[PDB]
Each structure stands twice: as C-alpha cells, then as structure tokens.
C-alpha cells in the first residue's frame, strides 16, 4: 500500500449497478463508456490500454476561456492569444513544479487519457445523449473548467484533508456540475455491451487501482507499457511479427536499404510489459524483474516453443503462460537493481526452459525467392554477440498505428456486412464517414469543408502510406470495392438515384486508392496488382479513370506492362460515347 501522488497513472473501476473499467470508443470519438463483459479486476480486459488515466493537478483556464468566448478587434484577439499562451506556460510550469506531491482527500484533480491525451470534462450546458435527465461527460483535447473534479471518500473511515491510498473507492464531483459520476445502465445502440457514463446523483463509486508511479514514470528508464524497437547489431536487422501465409510468425527481417536504422516498420514495434504481484500494476522494470514482449499491432506476445536449435521464437495470443516470460541480461555493468535505462543493449533469455536466444541465417520464407524472414532460435549456451539494442518510438507512430488498426477493424466489419447482401442505412453512413476520415488522413490536410473528392495534397506522407500498405487497409478498400458487385449493387444500375450513396462510397474508396500511391513504388505496385478489377469499373462515373491514369503514368514500367490495345480501344469507345475533353 502507498499514498496517491500527483502525476500517477491509475485505473478507475466502477462499483455499483454496473461494474467495469472506463473505456473510450474507437476512432476520434470522445464518448466514455463502461464494458462489464470486457473484463474485471481479476481478469483485466485485453484492450487495457484504454482504461489508463493519469492524475493531474488544478489547471487555470480563465484566460483560455476568455479567449474562446471572444473568438466565438484584431489587436484584442492577438492580446488574448498571447495571454492564453502565457497561461498555458504557467500551468505547465506549475504542473512540473508540483509533480509528485501527495494527493489529499477533498482536493481537486483531473483525469487525462494517456491513449487519447484528452482531459475528461463534464459539460454543464448540454445533457447526455441517451439519459436526457443526466449530464454529458466528454474528453476534450484542451480541457476547460469541467476538468476540475473534487475527490471525496466513499467510506466513513476517511475524512477531508487525508491522504489517498491505493485500492480505495472514491467519489468524483465536478466543480461546475457538482454531481457524482454515474455509470448509467443505458446500453449504447451503436456498440452492444457498452454503458454510457454521465453526471447525476447516485451511489456509484470508482475504485482507484495504481498502475504507474510518478517516481517510476521517468522517461529515461524503461517502463511497462512503453513501445520500442529491438535491433540486432551483428545481423543489422529488425525483429518483426507478420502473417506470412495466414499464420503469424516472428522473424528477423532482412533489409536491402543502405541504412539499417531507416528500415523501420509499424509491424516491427514492440511493447514491454512488467510482471508485478498486482496484475494491473506495471510500474517500472528492474534489472532483476521478469519481462514480457507484446506486439503493438497483432497483440500477440513473444515466446519460444519446441522447434520442429531446440526452440524457435513465435507469437502467442495470451501472456497467461510462463512461455511469454523473458529476462534482459545486461551486456555491460548495471547499477545493481536500478531501473533499466532506455536505449541500452540487452540479451534476451527465456526462463521458462532456461534457454538463451540466438540468431540464425536460416530463412523462414524459403518458399519465396530472395527470402527476407529469418529464423531466431535458442541455444543452451550463452553468446555475447546476441545482443539487442532498444530504440525509442515517437507518440505519433503509436497514434497512427492505433487509428489504422481501428479503421481496419471497422472496414473489415463493413466488408463482412456487404458480403452478407444487406447493409443498414446507418451502417452505410458510418462506412462513408470512415472512408472520409481515411481520405483526410491519407491526404494529411485539415478538414475545412473542402470537397474531398477534389482534395489536393502537396507532399505525400511516406510513413502514412507505408502504414496503410502494411496494415492491409488498401486490401480492405479493394474488398469494399469488389463486394457490392461481386447482387447488392450493379455497375449499370449506378446511374439510378437509389445507389447514389453507394456511388459516393466507391468514389471515396477510389480517392483513398489514388492518394496512397503518390510517388511510392511499393504502393503503386500493390494497387496495380488489382489492375483487372480496377479496369472492370472503367467508364462509369467512379473516377477509376483518373486513378488508373495517374498510377500508370507515374511509372513507366507499369504503363508498358499494363496498357495494351484493349485499354486504348476502351478509352476510344468511352470518349466517343461521352465526347468530353477529359
């Protein structure tokens, strides 16, 4: 047991009518709900990253509120902006100075969503979406006076002006709304099993479970839940996990680049998990503590299993077995049991069977010419050359990967719905909106109401395009394009007003396809592999023409291979039919 301190990252568990952790829906949705079926304290949910909150102290928003009110006088506006910036800097300085101070009962604290980086707030001028009599709670990127939340004891043992201890139920009262947060039983129609959270008088209590301590939250030391990359020095290659032939496999991918450090892929990102007595406690890993490795995209954990070398490295779905456990033997001297510093050479050891990890040149994908996947077995003895270096990862990559994974999930759901031969109007609207956000993300242009069908991007983002290619988002787009026709929709019937939303959906999909292959050979080839299906839609008002023309004209080889008498004849026929200069 320990006292609560400002800056600690803890998990909130609802107690009362509905029991569960606070989670946030997919995409940029700011709604906060509770999923009792997702998991419990004994068995935390698999997507536990969404149930982590950081405690922050009082933040002043008077200048920011005044500036926002004024915006909704150029010199006055500039002065207000300067005042808001100064207030933000002062708040940051205060947070830095007061960091680590103990939290006292009856004080004012704020909850920040680490995954979303949005402060929870209660809006006093609008009601909740479902429970009209209740009051709405939402996540705001910048926050407001609603972020302030008094903390009060739930039992009679404690009183005002007392230290807060881990594993205790507390009541959060907004300063403005002044109503304890309630996990309303009202189920969300959009997502089954999700219970909305609002602000209304009730008896619900939020248990506080400590996960990461302010002292152990230092970025200079490796901590559980942090994502990094493991690099091999001798092989000059990166470890990765991918679905080679329908089965997930872990391999040391070979790179033909002239700079090994630049051979970075999202699927090669790994996360470190610390083992503690409390399953929900991660803390910071010590040099004498057990460690686990997790895949930031597939979610499987690294492990070693009997090799058909005696043991080979693979990925497992759950970490509830000693196989996933691993230890990091330092290559150099260490400060006794001090926390592991980030970006330090280490050697992986498998304690389940007491075998030492090693690297071998035997490919795992010998079936394909010039294999890239390389086997990573284990040796009974220890080799000093098998040292893996840690590389940090910016938060932008994590955010992009999470968004891509969520979008791929919804696109797979949409493809399944389309293949079923029936899609609801609401589902179609959701799919169209998702394609809109995907177009905006690929174009990397702010959403200002401009016609996305004619959106113009000055400089393509190579990292985003690589993320789309490797995450199979383009495959999902192709499946969406091919599903209605395969029926649900027909090319000849697109002219009818009924299928107009479907026409716009195909339009958005083709825009996505065009925007992911701008001056990128790999994406261009990946899309061109479906040249037959792309040409099958030629002529119809879907703008397959512009995408095909751009893709094939950007590359000489693709134009030489693909264009033939048939394509020219089709173009001549369609221009005769329409007689348009385009």
């Amino acid at each position: 047991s320990s006292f609560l301190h400002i800056g600690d990252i803890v998990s909130l568990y609802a107690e009362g009518s509905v029991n569960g952790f606070i989670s946030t829906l997919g995409l940029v949705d700011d709604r906060c709900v509770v999923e009792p079926a997702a998991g419990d304290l004994d068995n935390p949910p698999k997507k536990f990253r969404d149930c982590l909150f950081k405690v922050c102290p009082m933040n002043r928003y008077s200048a920011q509120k005044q500036y926002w009110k004024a915006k909704q006088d150029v010199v006055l506006l500039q002065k207000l902006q300067h005042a808001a910036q100064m207030e933000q800097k002062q708040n940051d300085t205060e947070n830095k100075k007061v960091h680590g101070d103990v939290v006292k009962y009856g004080s004012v604290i704020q909850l920040l969503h680490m995954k979303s980086n949005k402060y929870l707030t209660v809006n006093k001028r609008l009601p909740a979406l479902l429970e009209k009599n209740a009051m709405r709670v939402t996540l705001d990127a910048t926050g407001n006076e609603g972020s302030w939340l008094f903390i009060q004891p739930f039992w009679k043992l404690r009183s005002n002006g007392d230290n807060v201890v881990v594993g205790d139920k507390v009541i959060l009262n907004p300063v403005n709304a002044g109503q304890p947060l309630h996990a309303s039983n009202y189920e969300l129609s959009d997502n089954a099993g999700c219970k909305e959270v609002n602000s209304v008088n009730c008896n619900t209590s939020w248990k506080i479970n400590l996960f990461m301590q302010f002292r152990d939250h230092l970025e200079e030391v490796l901590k559980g839940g942090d994502v990094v990359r493991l690099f091999h020095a001798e092989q000059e290659k990166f470890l990765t996990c991918d679905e080679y032939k329908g089965k997930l496999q872990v391999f040391l991918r070979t790179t033909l680049r002239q700079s090994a450090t630049s051979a970075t892929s999202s699927n090669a990102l790994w996360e470190v998990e610390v083992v503690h007595h409390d399953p929900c406690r991660g803390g910071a890993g010590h040099w004498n503590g057990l460690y686990r490795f997790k895949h930031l995209a597939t979610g499987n954990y690294l492990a070693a299993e009997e090799n058909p070398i005696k043991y080979c490295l693979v990925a497992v779905p759950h970490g509830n077995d000693i196989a996933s456990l691993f230890e990091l033997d330092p290559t150099t001297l260490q400060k006794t049991d001090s926390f592991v510093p980030r970006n330090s050479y280490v050697r992986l050891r498998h304690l389940c069977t007491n075998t030492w990890i090693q690297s071998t040149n035997v490919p795992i994908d010998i079936e394909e010419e010039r294999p890239i996947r390389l086997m990573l077995g284990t040796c009974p003895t220890k080799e000093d050359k098998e040292a893996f270096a840690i590389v940090s990862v910016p938060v932008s990559e994590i955010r992009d990967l999470d968004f891509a994974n969520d979008a791929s999930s919804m696109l797979a759901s949409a493809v399944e719905k389309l293949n079923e031969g029936f899609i609801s109007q609401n589902d179609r609207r959701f799919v169209i909106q998702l394609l809109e956000d995907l177009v905006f993300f690929v174009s990397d242009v702010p959403n200002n109401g401009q016609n996305v069908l004619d959106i113009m991007v000055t400089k393509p983002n190579r990292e985003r395009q690589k993320l789309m290619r490797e995450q199979n988002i383009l495959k999902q787009v192709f499946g969406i394009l091919k599903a209605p026709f395969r029926p649900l929709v027909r090319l000849e019937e697109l002219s009818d007003q009924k299928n107009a939303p479907y026409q716009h959906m195909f339009r958005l999909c083709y825009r996505v396809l065009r925007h992911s292959q701008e001056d990128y050979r790999k994406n261009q080839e990946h899309i061109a592999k479906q040249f037959g299906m792309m040409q099958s839609q030629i002529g119809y008002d879907i703008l397959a023409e512009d995408t095909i023309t751009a893709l094939l004209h950007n590359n000489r080889k693709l134009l030489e291979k693909h264009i033939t008498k048939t394509e020219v004849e089709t173009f001549v026929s369609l221009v005769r039919k329409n007689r348009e200069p385009r």
Partner: protein, 247 residues
C-alpha cells in the same frame, strides 16, 4: 417567513424527553387498528377536538420542526417515525385526506429533504409504494373531474404536498444515484402520465399551472435516460410541454 433553529431544537428535545404523554404515535399493531377504526368512523370529516385532530397537529408540528435543512431535529424526527409505519398508514385502502397530507409533509421535510444522507430511503420500495399511491390519487382526481364532482381537499392534497414531495425526491443531490430507478421505470412513467393528465385540465390556476410545469420538467429531466423511452402517445403532449418550457 423565517425559521428559528433554536426554538425547533428545544421543542424537539422537550417532546422527546417528555415521554409518550405528549407525543402519541399509532405505530403499534393494536394502535394502528385503533387509528384505522377511528379514521373509518370519521368518514364524513375530522372533528375539531377529536384525537385524530391532535395526532394530525402533532405530526404537522414535528414536520415543521424538522424543516429548515437541519441535522439535530431531523434525525430524531426520523427515528420517532420510520418509513414502514408511514407506508402502512398512508397506503391503506381506507384513509382520509388530512392524515395523508400530514404524513406526506412529514416524509418530505424529514426524509426527502434531509440535510444528511440516509441510505434507508433511496434503497427501499417504501417511497415507490408512496408514489404509486400518489398516481392513484391523481387518477382519482381525474376521474372525479370527469364526472364534474370532486372533493376540494383531495385536489389540494394532490396539488400542494404531492407535487412538492415528487419534486424533492427527483431534485435532491442524494437521489441522483438511485439504484432502483431502472427496475421501477413503469411507475415513474405512470407518474409522468398522471401529471400530464393533471396539466390537461382547464381549472388549474396560474400558480398551480407553474408548479405542475416545474414538477413535469423535473420528472422529465430525471427521466431523460434510465434505460427508458417516452411512449409516443404520452410523448405527444410532452413535446408541446418541452416547446412551451423552452419559450
């Protein structure tokens, strides 16, 4: 129009330490039966100096003493009369308007409007039984007005204390976390319906109209989301009420 806390305190202490001589409550089964018999014999009305009048006056005095959002007197008042006896006497098939008024006022000023949280109220079916009786009284008023013959005392009871208690129960900070609301949706819906019908009558006065509108607004606000929806036939007039309130 002001409350003397010290006078209330001394009155409460004097009544408690005086004994059963000054305060008489028909909480016992035999005492409850005697109260029932005397109430039945008083169908025409309540006599000026009958023991029923004394009991009603005592209950009113206790309710007034408990008023003022205090803690010294309210705890003792609640201890003297538990909710079970209030439900037993008020919910009995046979009753009189004056006793209902007195007990409802006592509940409102000693249980619903308590300054200190009490778990036994918002975690029991006593007040829900009370609310079903309130709905029954509203239906009785509506039926009586259907025949153009109604008792003014019953209308006053439904208008003055019934609405106040309903508003207090659904407008207190400690009631925002009621755990039995979801299982008791129907009753609250019924209440809303009843209130709507009571507002549909033309004889309602301007002050009564405003009070009923405020009560309906509070009920709707508490009825926004509780895993419940407003029936379309019932919502037909609720939409107009909301439009008028917005104006």
């Amino acid at each position: 129009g002001k409350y003397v806390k010290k006078c209330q305190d001394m009155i409460m202490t004097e009544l408690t330490n005086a004994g059963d001589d000054v305060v008489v409550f028909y909480n016992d089964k035999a005492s409850l039966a005697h109260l029932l018999d005397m109430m039945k014999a008083a169908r025409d009305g309540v006599e000026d100096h009958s023991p029923l009048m004394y009991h009603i006056s005592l209950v009113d005095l206790l309710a007034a003493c408990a008023e003022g959002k205090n803690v010294y007197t309210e705890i003792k008042c609640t201890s003297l009369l538990p909710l079970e006896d209030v439900v037993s006497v008020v919910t009995h098939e046979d009753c009189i308007t004056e006793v209902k008024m007195a007990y409802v006022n006592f509940v409102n000023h000693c249980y619903v409007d308590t300054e200190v949280e009490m778990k036994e109220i918002y975690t029991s079916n006593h007040i829900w039984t009370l609310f079903e009786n309130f709905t029954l009284d509203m239906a009785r008023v509506c039926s009586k007005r259907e025949k153009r013959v109604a008792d003014p005392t019953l209308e006053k009871y439904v208008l003055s204390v019934v609405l106040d208690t309903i508003n207090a129960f659904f407008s207190s900070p400690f009631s925002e976390n009621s755990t039995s609301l979801q299982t008791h949706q129907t009753i609250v819906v019924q209440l809303l319906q009843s209130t709507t019908r009571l507002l549909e009558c033309p004889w309602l006065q301007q002050q009564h109209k405003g009070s009923v509108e405020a009560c309906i607004r509070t009920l709707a606000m508490v009825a926004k989301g509780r895993a419940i929806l407003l029936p379309m036939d019932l919502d037909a007039h609720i939409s107009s009420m909301l439009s008028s309130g917005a104006s």
